[PDB]
Amino acid sequence: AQCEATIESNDAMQYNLKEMVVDKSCKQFTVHLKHVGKMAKVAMGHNWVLTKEADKQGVATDGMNAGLAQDYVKAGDTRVIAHTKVIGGGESDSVTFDVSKLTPGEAYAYFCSFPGHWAMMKGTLKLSN
Amino acid sequence: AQCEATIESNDAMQYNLKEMVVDKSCKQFTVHLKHVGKMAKVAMGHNWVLTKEADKQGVATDGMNAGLAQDYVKAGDTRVIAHTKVIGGGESDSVTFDVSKLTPGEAYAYFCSFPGHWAMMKGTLKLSN
């Protein structure tokens, strides 16, 4: 295995992956997000945010409140392990994070914090071998 | 025949109608919105808002900032000809307005102003011809 994954987002407000597994041999993990549709980021922008499954809705709320210039993530939100920028159709963004931030056996939520998207764009991330 | 129409909204962020025609025989018109999904308004709330095609993005934006308790529509928004409340799955709302507010030959936009829904929940309303 290896320490990176590619996820796709489209114009129908969906990710193509519902779960991601980070190999235990990984010190760092890289998430490559692609926006496969053609809608503007102002209309159907997408990001990828990682948090404890618990913090999902709270980070989502504060994120909506941060605005597009903050990539719909409250700046310095400590419940956020990692996040990409918001991208529109045709673009891509990557984020690399320290695997040490994850706790083995625990589950994580990854979701899109662009306004209203968290309800449909959500998945699970877990650390496994 | 009637001066009424029922439009459905679901969990996939779709309206079941993409165009609505108001008969010239009507003095008034009623729109019955039904949310036939099973998601709560906090996650997939839907409303029906009618504006001139050009006011769509401004009304949506401003409605966004008004909040859920305001049905995601700014109070006294003069660009809004008519709107229902935001409803969740299993609920319905009706709105009646004056046909004289519409101009024969003009295209109106109807859309959902819940955060991020306008891009997907939008249709056209016009007078009969």
Side-chain angles (χ1 to χ4, degrees):
Chain A
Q2 43 170 4
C3 316
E4 84 177 3
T6 296
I7 181 166
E8 304 179 352
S9 54
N10 72 2
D11 285 346
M13 215 195 283
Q14 326 175 300
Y15 281 135
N16 69 327
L17 292 194
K18 322 76 201 165
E19 47 166 70
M20 302 188 159
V21 166
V22 347
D23 192 73
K24 291 192 146 161
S25 74
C26 299
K27 225 302 170 134
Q28 305 169 317
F29 193 82
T30 301
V31 177
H32 303 282
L33 174 73
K34 301 209 294 183
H35 193 322
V36 139
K38 60 197 201 291
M39 278 200 216
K41 76 180 108 282
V42 155
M44 176 55 66
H46 306 314
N47 72 4
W48 181 97
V49 180
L50 187 63
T51 67
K52 270 204 171 217
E53 207 132 80
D55 304 320
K56 166 153 140 279
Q57 258 193 96
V59 160
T61 285
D62 292 347
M64 187 179 150
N65 298 347
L68 178 63
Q70 286 310 139
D71 297 302
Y72 287 116
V73 177
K74 167 164 70 121
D77 191 337
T78 51
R79 313 165 282 175
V80 171
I81 295 151
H83 73 89
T84 66
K85 287 188 195 307
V86 169
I87 65 168
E91 308 178 84
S92 71
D93 191 44
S94 289
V95 64
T96 300
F97 57 90
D98 194 328
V99 175
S100 275
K101 301 183 164 198
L102 316 184
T103 285
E106 193 174 349
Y108 299 93
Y110 52 83
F111 51 96
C112 177
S113 70
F114 179 90
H117 292 197
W118 63 264
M120 282 184 63
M121 306 191 67
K122 200 264 163 171
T124 293
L125 184 143
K126 38 175 272 255
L127 193 43
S128 162
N129 67 37
Chain B
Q2 257 181 344
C3 298
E4 267 189 26
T6 305
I7 177 174
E8 305 188 340
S9 51
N10 69 13
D11 292 338
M13 266 165 82
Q14 308 161 306
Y15 277 129
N16 71 333
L17 296 175
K18 38 247 76 185
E19 157 177 350
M20 291 181 49
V21 178
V22 170
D23 193 84
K24 266 158 156 175
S25 85
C26 312
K27 179 172 220 207
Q28 291 198 306
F29 197 77
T30 301
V31 171
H32 303 288
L33 174 67
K34 314 229 296 144
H35 185 327
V36 301
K38 62 204 207 315
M39 279 190 268
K41 74 207 202 108
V42 76
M44 179 75 46
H46 299 313
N47 71 4
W48 181 94
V49 180
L50 175 78
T51 71
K52 281 145 53 192
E53 196 47 76
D55 297 344
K56 177 184 52 137
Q57 213 211 105
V59 165
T61 295
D62 279 353
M64 181 157 53
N65 312 324
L68 177 58
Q70 282 300 306
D71 295 308
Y72 282 117
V73 160
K74 188 176 95 205
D77 194 333
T78 71
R79 296 159 307 176
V80 172
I81 302 163
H83 74 85
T84 69
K85 269 184 142 266
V86 163
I87 55 174
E91 299 161 5
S92 91
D93 198 31
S94 299
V95 60
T96 303
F97 59 87
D98 275 34
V99 173
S100 58
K101 285 171 146 210
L102 312 184
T103 279
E106 221 195 337
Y108 297 87
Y110 58 80
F111 53 94
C112 176
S113 65
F114 180 97
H117 291 202
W118 67 268
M120 275 182 84
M121 298 189 72
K122 196 267 175 173
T124 288
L125 181 150
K126 65 232 102 181
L127 242 9
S128 72
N129 80 301

